[PDB]
């Protein structure tokens, strides 16, 4: 997928409505109601965080419109999710201004937009269990290796390599940041990452000039952004939930077409247990993520608070309220 | 005994409870899990709300709290989280039956709950006695529970930690007796005779509350109900805490396999299949009887029994492959 001459020139015209400017800096901001602004909203966030002279604008608008093209029309892992994850990374880096290099803020905003590129709405287990081509290629973190492969594809396209103008080494530094960040969105790898950071922060040996330590903190940040649907206002959070299950149930529907019972999270015949499942996901995954994050990055506390507020709302739904 | 630093207890005095949580704390099913940084301050609030703001001096109290956390170990279940969970359930029981207990007992039972598993290594009473651990020789029966009380007194005897200094020396030994008895009653090996005795004293109608020997038995049942209160939370919380319990059990079951001895199925991670039926039998024989007799004695404590029943249906739904 390469964007036409027709698409990206309109993106160079876009100026963000000034009434938002302040509301976009909030952690809990929702990009939902501004669909035709999401491509330019990403341009805005790149210019604010990295400077307008960071990328040359012609190359940048092409890359954003091609990446958008390569997102399938699935309920949840779509173009809206990519810009929602990218905004959370924007808010984290804006509130941790003096912690990350220019190169890291470049890659991470790029990595978040492309972290789910060409998602087909299926979990890694589905591709591996039922012998998908990509699973025969990428044995572990199947889609995550595909997501990074899809990004490198677009970057190698003509007029798209926004990283054309870095040092030849500096560029190979960016791709490692982008790869490790996208690989870190594999939720299965999150538990080892967050437990390692737990012991490290606790023992005090968490060293922020240790590169592998930096990559672990980046990975937790990628997880925090990937889950940021739990950190919006409860009206927004409850709505994104409907998108998540519609895609889960669709994968489980394919599981039934054989003759197998999917896990209850992917069974539409078990919608009643959804509020309990959310309460369990927040306590087992979400709360640990943003708690270790806030411990490492104190400015990211609004995420932890918003996640706690959303957790009590699910508890009220379970408790008959 | 690891003493807490000054920055630890200083930040505790400045802590304020978020307005919204003040209401949710009073509910039996309240789950402290998602508010880890708030756990020490939550205990301050529960002490203040039940025992008064002038009860303990905030300086010594915040020292005792943060030092008790430091002496709780990093085992999968019997840790700092478990202490505040048991302490909260006691607060809820005490709040809903406030004037039924003295002011000295509310001070004793809340403090004893916070310290009831101090310095837990993650090994049951049977392990330490089988492999003649030194503590099994110093404490013949109720091995860890007697040590927990010794750990509790060691913290009180630390410089500037004694929150009971301002009691009359009669009431000093009095509250220490309530605390010693409460921490001993958390030995589940004693609950079964004590619950059976309370059940008979109730149905015949001879259970009297200012009968001191009866009073300790009722406090013992309250200490048991608080120790098991994870069965009284919402289903997803109870499953997550069940994983904490089995993670520690199975670790002890591995050590016996290193010594060539098959552990009991409860501590055998190769018998994970029997987990739902093992929970079903624990509820029927232990948990449900505990809160049933407790609700007969203190009817305000019912929501524990109903929530314990709610999770009994879920454990039965799991055994039927659902
Ligand atoms: C794959 C990771 O999930 C997410 O990314 C995810 C989810 C999922 C939806 N949800 C579940 C989860 C279950 C479970 O199976 C719970 N089982 C406990 N553990 C194993 C015993 C694993 C956690 C479930 C069961 C019945 C009905 C509905 C259910 N819904 C987690 N909700 C959000 C919201 C915001 C951002 C992300 N997520
Ligand atoms: C003793 C202390 O137990 C607790 O504190 C405890 C427990 C225990 C874990 N559990 C068991 C218990 C068994 C048993 O062996 C039950 N005994 C049955 N026999 C009759 C006497 C003969 C069949 C078990 C067996 C296999 C696999 C797993 C198993 N899990 C009880 N569950 C909770 C939940 C919430 C708060 C507390 N607890
Ligand atoms: Mg993904
Ligand atoms: Mg104990
Ligand atoms: Zn994602
Ligand atoms: Zn206990």
DSSP line for A27-76:
TT---TT-GGGHHHHHHHHHHHHH-TTSS-HHHHHHHHHHHHHTS---SS
- B281 CB less than 6 Å from ligand 2? yes
CA contacts within 13 A on the Cβ side of B16: 3
Asked if residue A267 belongs to a known ligand binding site, the reply is no
Q: What 8-state DSSP symbol labels residue B36? A: G
Q: Which fold has domain B13-322?
A: Catalytic domain of cyclic nucleotide phosphodiesterase 4b2b (1.10.1300)
**Could you state, in order of their start, the residue ranges of all structural domains in chain A?**
12-321
- Spot the catalytic one: A28, A47, A77, A213: A77
The arrangement of secondary structure in A12-321, i.e. its CATH architecture, is: Orthogonal Bundle (1.10)
Start-end of H helices in chain B:
6-14, 19-25, 39-51, 58-70, 80-95, 103-114, 125-130, 134-138, 143-156, 169-185, 188-203, 212-227, 235-258, 275-282, 288-297, 302-319
Residues B89-100, buried b or exposed e (16+ Cβ, 10 A)?
Answer: bbbbbbbbeeee
Residues B264-290, buried b or exposed e (16+ Cβ, 10 A)?
Answer: ebbbbeeeeeebbebbbebbeebbbbb
- Structural biology method used: X-ray
Distance (Å, whole) CA A120 – CA A74? 7
Check: CB of residue A289 under 8 Å from CB of residue A223.
Answer: yes
Check: CB of residue A90 under 8 Å from CB of residue A37.
Answer: no
The backbone torsions φ and ψ at residue B233, rounded to the nearest 5 degrees and listed phi first, read -90, 175
Q: Cβ contacts of residue A257 below 8 Å, gap of 6+? A: none
The 10 Å Cβ neighbour count of residue B54 is 8
**Which residues have CB less than 5 Å away from ligand 4 (the ion)?**
B 117, 186
Give the three-class secondary structure for B157. Answer: coil
Resolution of the experimental structure, in angstroms: 2.3
The beta-carbon neighbor of B234 closest among A287, A291, A318 is A318
Per-residue tokens: B54: 């002038």
Q: What 8-state DSSP symbol labels residue A286? A: I
Residue of A272, A308, A314, A317 to mutate when probing chain B, most B C-beta within 10 A? A308
Asked if residue B78 belongs to a known ligand binding site, the reply is yes
Distance (Å, whole) CA A273 – CA A318? 9
Å from CA of B182 to ligand 6 middle: 11
Burial class, A153, CB count within 10 angstroms (exposed 0-12 / middle 13-18 / buried 19+): middle
User: Which is it for the CA torsion B152, B9, A300, B32, positive or negative?
Assistant: positive
């Amino acid at each position: 997928s390469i964007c036409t001459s027709e698409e990206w020139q309109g993106l160079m015209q876009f100026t963000l409505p000034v009434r938002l400017c302040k509301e976009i800096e909030l952690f809990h901001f929702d990009i939902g109601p501004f669909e035709n602004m999401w491509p330019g909203i990403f341009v805005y966030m790149v210019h604010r965080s990295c400077g307008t002279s960071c990328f040359e604008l012609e190359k940048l608008c092409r890359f954003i419109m091609s990446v958008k093209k390569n997102y399938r029309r699935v309920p949840y892992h779509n173009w809206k999710h990519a810009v929602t994850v990218a905004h959370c990374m924007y808010a984290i880096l804006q509130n941790n201004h003096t912690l990350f290099t220019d190169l890291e803020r470049k890659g991470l905003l790029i990595a978040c937009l492309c972290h789910d590129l060409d998602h087909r709405g299926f979990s890694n287990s589905y591709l591996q269990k039922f012998d998908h081509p990509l699973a025969a290629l990428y044995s572990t973190s199947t889609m995550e290796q595909h997501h990074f492969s899809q990004t490198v594809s677009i970057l190698q396209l003509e007029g798209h390599n926004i990283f054309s103008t870095l040092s030849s080494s500096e560029y190979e530094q960016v791709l490692e940041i982008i790869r490790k960040a996208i690989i870190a969105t594999d939720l299965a790898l999150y538990f080892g990452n967050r437990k390692q950071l737990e012991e490290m922060y606790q023992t005090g040996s968490l060293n922020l000039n240790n590169q592998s330590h930096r990559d672990r903190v980046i990975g937790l940040m990628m997880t925090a952004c990937d889950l940021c649907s739990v950190t919006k206002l409860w009206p927004v959070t409850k709505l994104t939930a409907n998108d998540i299950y519609a895609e889960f149930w669709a994968e489980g529907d394919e599981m039934k077409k054989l003759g197998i019972q999917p896990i209850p999270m992917m069974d539409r015949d078990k919608k009643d247990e959804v509020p309990q499942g959310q309460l369990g996901f927040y306590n087992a995954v979400a709360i640990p993520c943003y708690t270790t994050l806030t411990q490492i990055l104190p400015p990211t506390e609004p995420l932890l608070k918003a996640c706690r507020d959303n957790l009590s709302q699910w508890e009220k739904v379970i408790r008959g309220e």
